[PDB]
Structure formats: structure tokens, C-alpha cells
């Protein structure tokens, strides 16, 4: 166990040892790709899941065998017979928290700020999209108000989710035998726009909340084939929400979860191995936050984004279409890396802590993801800054650290991740820039992945709340809607089962815990910095527990006790 | 990648490097115990399953989710409604090979010699046990012969399986909620005696003659059943199969492959340098062995695990059987070498009649295992000769001498049958030890592990517990009677779950290690072993065209390099 040091501070003997270790690491951590996604060529045994991990994962899979044994769902591509059958899918599993209230408009809307994908909603500035022709009359009928849209917008009261990033998907296909013949079917794609309003009054008892106003299921308006639905539209409104939720779930899995936690971490894990000695302070800082990350990304390669895997079976598009969405989300992230730092990302959507009205109040006061993620972001930043200050007291030490400079060059290179938004001026020159990079990597690996991964079961294991594909077209607005209509839009039995299977496996345990690495730092000064980070997380836990006593609903996913140390499941 | 060498031949500097490695290995491979069974304290990450292993094991578990989705079995402690329902448990899985023919007496008997547990049957010498009062009249009625029992025994025609090792099990209990009421029930244990005869006519094969379901005879409450007893005979075979299945899992499989290997794996780490030739030889045959034994600890022999759920006895009773089986093996280690084990049961290749033909001519486990035993023996002799030429190099190898001391010690495995004269002194003795270890880890484990699905995933052929008492020999047997003896739905499902996971894939392959030997001479000896395995594969393929049913489990292409599943 070596005291960490910068390579230029070491003797020539010690530097030879560092280069030896790096050369060996480069041989063990080679770069590869699947479908243009950067991944590892072969996983080192040191990077495999632990025994303890495997025991927990297996308990999960065996719990699914038991639940399936106790369930009445069948291995068929028929719809369920009754909508109530979706409630019977959990005889031996926890009931998903959304299950009993998912029909409520407020429960729908609050998933934008506290559900699995709190990453889409943005404040409307200036005007709605021209292809989303909501009228004053619609707004006024739904809000029971004489205020106009322009007035609401001028007050910062309107919010939108625009799923146009899904507009080019080729719809996925599926097929099966029924009575000795092959039936071939296609999923139905949608790319909705959803308008929300902040309602300060709430419902008399004055916890304010977001409320949904209008849904246009596809991007190009048409009064007949693509009208705007509102809550006045009865069962047609319920169906419009289903399509919007399906769209949110596709954006969730491809963009917010797979692309922008799991797969954008892969180049950082590999660059750390390919350029940093084992006793490099940055490697020692970052490796606890990479535990099991290569391995879980290899399972995603094998089981999630493979032909016949979960993405192929469950999502709206063809596998090829889903992979294209994933790769475009990676590219935009890497190209703009520092603009995806949490405060900047939120501010770009108009929903950051600085987005306030004339009285200093946030235009979106009820946003548990933002509130709790900012606590964790700020605590990690203090932890990282205090840690790196033990090793870099002056910027020349950044510039003369040949390993660190190689780590940056690897990341920005085309073959190393193409992280062209990583640094300014073509080179890492300051300590504060490195603090921001390492803060963002640790934030993504622990907190961000916890926020998008662990709500999956509560909101997406109950299939009707967020089905990963829709299986019939939106009915015409004047058509009558039966239970059969809804059951034909929702997934068939075998695919509903498959989606529960996925969601349970992704949420069943916590592989590790934020701030609690498997081995202590050798440097007692760094162990003290870590102990203070652990104290701060305890303070943050109690603050969130207090906030949750007053929130409309508790938001538990960013409690530090529930945040892993690494992206690992 | 350093040339292997004996420690006494190394420099002082090399010797201190060897000793540092051994000290680190002792720290990473510490000894521990669960319920008196020797295991590792903490599994080193280097000893974990590989990614590729995990991917295959996960395919197997997901296949069970899919199969269960497509099945109609329920999560209940009720019996199945019809016996035919046991045949509908495999909508998306391979059909177990025994399923169609399991009622046939010949198919029942041939599981003694080609089934999951080919380790029990033995030739009757002198007389039957006194607590098994088979009479001439019974024998003559079953065999439709005038030969007496004593004449048949004198000709070496009779064979027996005696499950007396189960006679003291406390019966397992189970409970469930049924209408806000907690129901508690007990399994029924049995310790049968089964008489077999070799019947030359056909073609020639073993035939079952008589079953007594428990050890103490009584003409009314524990009678001798024969093939003349109709459905009662069918039920007696169920109890005999259940007993074979319990002896299989506790003794032949868990004890005498998985758990007796654990001390050898730990001794190798605790006493041999990484470049010790014996460590280099053995470690390919230990791949994933510590890890699979840790899953056995956690999932198989834990409270609420598979053994607790499925086996006839309480968990404490099954663990006692396991531990007794380990101790007899270790106390008599060299006597469990394949040729000597077969000979002690009267069924070895030397057990021949006046005309030179075996008393038990049809014995695929024996014939194919002997081929692999002999090939491994040549491999380890030719390999070890590269490094030991005279016994003084055996005696002056301090690491090897420590390896033996560790194994025979009370805290390293207590392998008191390992060595003669208190000490390992010859190359041939070490050849015998390493041959047996490699044989157990590959071939023996293959022969007891991979038939589990074909013979035990079809629950009526070999249920791991019985759930009602043997009916009175005079009662009418209904379909419901049999369904109450066989496992309830939930426990049948749990037995299929287990047997599928134990058989889904081959983690590695006999003779094909992950890394080449650095020593080119050792590479050549390994290549010769691979060639011999190819010859054996073709010889077994030829035998399988003349056997009544193929025995595929010891084809070298189906034998792993290590006990790993
Ligand atoms: Fe994840
Ligand atoms: Fe096994």
C-alpha cells in the first residue's frame, strides 16, 4: 500500500515502476466497441462482481422465479384480459408505489420532478413550439381561469416536456405463432409534447404542484389525426397520458439511464486504467466510484443492448433505432461535458436554483430531484476539492503531471471517448478544472445513477403507469374507448412480464454505499477528508428526512443511505 | 510467467520470493468452517467466477423464469392434481431423458450403473443382510427359476443397494399459511434395501428383485415388495429412488466431489509457491471450485436453502450425513481411488467369473471412468517426471512436505489416509494423489453432476423427499395416493429449479486450461493428454452404439476441467 504521489515528484526508480504498472494496465484494459459504443475488450478478473454481489443478484432472480410461480400471467403475446390483472403481477414482490394512484393527473405530473426521469421538463420561455398549437381557450378551460397563455408564460408558470428526440425512431417489430401460423406485428411510436402549469394553490390545502394541461401525442399537429388532448377528454386523456409515459420511459432508459450514467462513465474508467499509476492520487480518488462499473456495462452489452435482449424486446423502436438514440445522447453529453454539470444542466432547462420570480421564489418550487441532488453535488465538490488540495497545491503541478495530462489526452481522443467538452484550450491547466471534472464523474456514478435507476421499480414495474412500448395506435378522438382498447395499447402478457423482470433486477439491492469504500485511504489526511464527507452525508440525510415530512410525497432515492458509491446495477 | 521449479533448487533470493508469495497467499486463503465443514474464510476476488461464467449462469436462471411463466404449476403446498402434470413442467426446457421410460424396471435398475449416483451398488457375497429376509420362494417367483438365493450368490449374480446410511435422519419439516392458519407437516424418511440380479437373457441387464423400504423387517408394517406387487411395487421404487437421491446429493455429490476438494485447494494456496510445479499442475483443476463451494454454503446447505427445502432430513440431519461422508473419504483417501473403490464394492474390472467375464458386464460409469482415470494417471506421471526424477527431490521439497502436513493436520482437512509412513517419500505416491484429485475434480464430478437434470428434474423418477408414509401392502392405491407421496407443487418446482441450474452449462473443459504452461515440455505433456482424450471420446462413441442406451456424461467433451457448477 503506497502513499499516493504525483509522478514528477517520484524518483527515477519509482517512475519506472509507475510506467511498468501502467503498461500492464493498458494490456489488461483494452478498448473495444459494440455498435459504436465504447466498451472494454475483455474484463479483468479484478473488475468482476464480488461473491457478495453475485449472491444478492441471484436472490433477485430467484425471487422472480417465485413471483412468476405465484402469478397468473402467461407466456403469450395476447393482452391481459382485465386492466386489474396488471395489479395482480406482484404476489411475492413489493407493490410498486405508483400502483394505486397512477391515474391521478397530479401523480402523472409529479413524475417529471420526482420519478425515474426527472431530466426532461423545462420552463417555457417566450412561446410554445409552433408545432404545438395550444390555445388560450384550452388553457382557460383547464385552469378555470381568464389568464391567457402569453400571460402565464410571462409569469414563468408553464413547463413543457418535448419528446421530439424520439420522432425518428423506426418502430420495433415482434412476431409469434398463433394456431400454426406466424403473426407479425409492429409497435406504435410516439413523440409527444406535454404542457404543464405550476398551480400555486394546489387543491385548496396549499401544497402547490405541477398540473398537466395538454398532450399532443405526435410532433406534427393535425386536428384529426394528431389533436391536442386535455383533461376534459375523458378516456382519450387517459390514453394520451399512456403515450406520454411510454415516451418518458424510452427517453429514460436510452438517454437518462443507459447513455448518461452507465455508458458515459466507461471512458473514464478506461482512461484511469490506461494512464494513471495505481498510486496516482486521482486514481485512488476515483476507483471506489468505479467499482463494478465495467462489469455492469458488460452485462448491459450482453443482456440489455444485444439482439433479443431487453431493449430489443421492450422499447418502442427497433434495437437499431434505440442504439442510435443512445449514441446521440452519449455524443451530446461528451461534446458538452461540463455543460452537463448539475447546476448548469438545471439552469439550461430553466429549472435551476437561480430560476426565480421577482420575489425570489423558484418558478418550480416542488422539485425533489433538484433539491436533493444539489445537496449531494455540493458535498461531493467539497470532498473532491479538499482531497485534491492534499496533492495539488499549485497549478504547475497539474500541468507537470504527465499521467494526468495523458489521462486528459486519452479522454478527448477519438478512440478514448471523444470527450471534446472536457477541457478548455486543448489541455488541463488548473486545479479547479480538475475539481469540477472529478466532482461530475463522482456525482454521475453515485447520485445521478441512483436518481434514475432506483425509481424504476416504483414507477415502471407497474406496467400501465409507464409501459416501455405501446402496441396499438391512439384511437381517433371521437371513437369510443373500451377496456379492450386500452388493453391492446398496453403491452401483451409476455412483454409485461419481461418489463417487471428487468425492473426488479435493476432495483433489488445496493451494491455499495456513497462515501464508504471497501478499503481505507493509506494517506491519513485523505481518510480524514473522507470521514468529513461521511459526516456531511449524515447531515444531508437528516435534512432530506425533514424535507420529506413536509413534501406531498416522500422522495427517498437521494437519501445518502440509498445512494451507491458507483454505477453498479 | 516463470519457469516452475522445486524450492530446494532455487537461489536464496528466489527462495525468499517464493516465501513472500506463500505468506501473502496464506493471508488471502484463510481457513474457516460452517457446521464443521472446512471452507475458505474470504474468497479472493481472483477466485471469483468469470464474467463468461456469470453470463451463462444468468442465462440459466432467466430460462427458469421463462419456463415458470409458461408452466401451469402453482406456488402451493398442494399435490399436483394429476400425475401427468409432472410431464408438463418443461414447456421451455429440454425434456429430462428418463421421463418417458422411468416406470420400466430396467430403467430403474440401470440408474445404479449409469444414473446420477453410480456409486452404491455392490455385489452380494456370502449372504444378504440378516435384516433383509428375502427367501428362496420369493427369489424363484420373481426370477421364474428353480435356482436358490444361495446358488445365485455363489455365482455372483446378486447385487444390493443398502441405504442404511439414512436410517438415523430426523425427518424434515415444512410449514405454510393456509387460511390464516399455520400448517406444519413432516416428510417421511426411508432407508431401503434393494436386491438386484444380473439377468443374462434379453440383452443382458440388471433387474430389480426386491425392495424393503425400511431397515427393520416386519411382514405387515415393513414387508418385502417385489415386481409382483403391482402399484405397491411402483411406490416402493419411489422410496428407493428418493433414498438414492439423498445419498446422491449428500454423499456422492456434495461431500465426495465439492467438499473433499476444498482442503486440497486451500493447501495448494497455503503451502505451494505460484511457480511450484504441483501448484501449476493442480490449479487449472481448481478453477471456480472455491467459488462454487461458497455458493453451496450460501444457497445449498444454508437455513432455507435447497437442501433444507428439498431433502428428506432436517438440515442438521443432512449436514451430519455430509460430514460423515467427508470423514470416511479423508480417513481412507487412497482407498477411494477409482480402481480400489470399485473393487471394494465387488464391481471392479477384476471382479470376473470363472470364464473371465465381469459379474456386472454392463457398467458404463466404470468402463468410461477407468479410461479417464488411466489417461489422467499417465498425464500426471509424465508431467511430474519433468520435475521429480528421484525420491530425494520429493523428500527435500519443503513446500511439498508442508502441503502434506497441512492436509493431514486436524485444521487442514484431516486427510489421514493421504500418505504412508507418516510422510510423502516417493514420486509414485504423489502421482497417485494428484491423479485422484484431478479425477475427482473433472470426471467424478461430471459423472455425479451432469445426470441430475435427466434423472432428477423429472420429479417422479427421483423425488428428493417423500411426503406420505408407504401405504399398507393391502390398501388400494389411487392416483391421489401417489400424488400425496410425491412432492407438492412448490417443492417440485424448487427441485426443477435446482437441477436446471446445476446442469445448464460446462464452465470449462477437461484438458483445456485457460493459460498455457510456460514450460514447453509441460505443454507437450498436456498436448499428449489432449490427444489421449480424443482417442477416449471415439472409443466411448463406439461403445455407445452397442450399449442399450448411450452414456454420454464421461465423454471428454462433456467433462469439465474442474468442479465448478
Ligand atoms: Fe443502472
Ligand atoms: Fe456440482
Residue numbers in the entry:
A (entry chain A): 1 to 569
B (entry chain B): 1 to 202, 207 to 569
How is this structure described in the published paper?
Lipoxygenases (LOX) are key enzymes in the initial step of lipid-mediator biosynthesis. They catalyze a regio- and stereo specific dioxygenation of polyunsaturated fatty acids to yield fatty acid hydroperoxides, which can be further metabolized to a variety of signaling molecules with diverse biological functions. We demonstrate the importance of an active site clamp around the pentadiene system, which fixes the pentadiene during the reaction resulting in 11-HPODE formation.
CspLOX2 crystallized in space group P212121 with one homodimer in the asymmetric unit. A well-defined boot-shaped channel connects the surface of the protein with its active site. The catalytic non-heme iron, deeply buried in the CspLOX2 active site, is coordinated by three invariant histidines (His257, His262, His449), Asn453 and the carboxy group of the C-terminal Ile569. The sixth ligand of the octahedrally coordinated iron, which is positioned towards the putative substrate-binding channel, is a water (Fe2+-H2O) or hydroxide molecule (Fe3+-OH) acting as a catalytic base for hydrogen abstraction during catalysis. Besides Leu304, we could identify further crucial residues in the direct environment of the narrow active site that form a clamp-like structure, including Leu258, Ile296, Ala300, Leu502 and Leu506. This putative channel connects the surface of the protein with the base of the substrate-binding channel at the opposite site of the iron, which is in line with the antarafacial oxidation of the substrate and a high dioxygen concentration at the pro-R face of C-11. Despite extensive efforts, we could not obtain crystals of a CspLOX2 substrate complex.
